[PDB]
């Protein structure tokens, strides 16, 4: 039920967990439907994420991280302006330390594969390919839309492209970074990224 209710992620999460709860109650005074606290999902499966060199990277190395989804588009001048600052930020965060702190998973708003590959060739952080339905379901879950083309269920469009959302373990938004938002504090809202609190459990 966080940060939204009517999202594909939350719908499928509710389905799985409530199915599991029913089965467990049948096998074994538990409360139906199950609590949001007792709900659980796996977000990125084994074959979801992949690195710069197109080698598969599992879920398990996102632990102890400040992990953020970067919703971005190829053609957007705002995205092209945002990108080198975030490159510098990533490099200077990950380099001044023995281990790495922040991690960025890339979600695309490109029209096609050609644009996806062309823009992705620049990025060294982690990315999800365009054809995977994970991108679309995460996009609806975190309310990113370039324009209101898809029916959303009474929501307001939280972000415009580009936007970085810091995520938690259960799909909860850890914190919002206001690039093009309520604060409009563009291109240096990346400084507001704290990494005490936003830990990928």
């Amino acid at each position: 039920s966080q940060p939204v209710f009517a999202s594909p992620l939350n719908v499928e999460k509710r389905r799985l967990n409530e199915e599991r709860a029913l089965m467990q109650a049948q096998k074994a005074n538990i409360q139906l439907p199950p609590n949001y606290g007792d709900m659980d999902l796996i977000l990125f499966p084994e074959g979801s994420l992949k690195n710069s060199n197109n080698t598969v990277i599992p879920q398990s190395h996102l632990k102890g991280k400040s992990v953020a989804l970067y919703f971005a588009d190829g053609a957007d001048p705002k995205c092209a302006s945002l990108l080198p600052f975030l490159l510098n930020y990533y490099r200077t965060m990950n380099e001044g330390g023995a281990n790495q702190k922040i991690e960025i998973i890339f979600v695309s708003l490109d029209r096609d594969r050609e644009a996806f590959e062309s823009h992705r060739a620049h990025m060294p952080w982690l990315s999800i390919d365009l054809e995977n339905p994970l991108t679309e379901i995460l996009k609806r879950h975190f309310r990113v839309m370039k324009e209101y083309e898809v029916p959303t269920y009474g929501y307001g469009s939280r972000t415009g492209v580009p936007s970085v959302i810091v995520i938690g373990s259960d799909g909860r938004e850890a914190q919002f970074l206001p690039i093009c938002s309520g604060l409009e504090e563009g291109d240096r809202a990346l400084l507001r990224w704290d990494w005490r609190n936003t830990k990928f459990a």
């Binding site: 966080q2 940060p3 949001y36 209101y148 307001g156 469009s157 909860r172 309520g182």
Partner: peptide, 22 residues
């Protein structure tokens, strides 16, 4: 040709049902 209305209030944007501390 029409455009959809996509705007919501200051209250809805800022005040959601936050999950409680334990």
């Amino acid at each position: 040709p029409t455009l959809p209305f996509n705007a919501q209030s200051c209250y809805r944007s800022e005040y959601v049902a936050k999950p409680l501390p334990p």
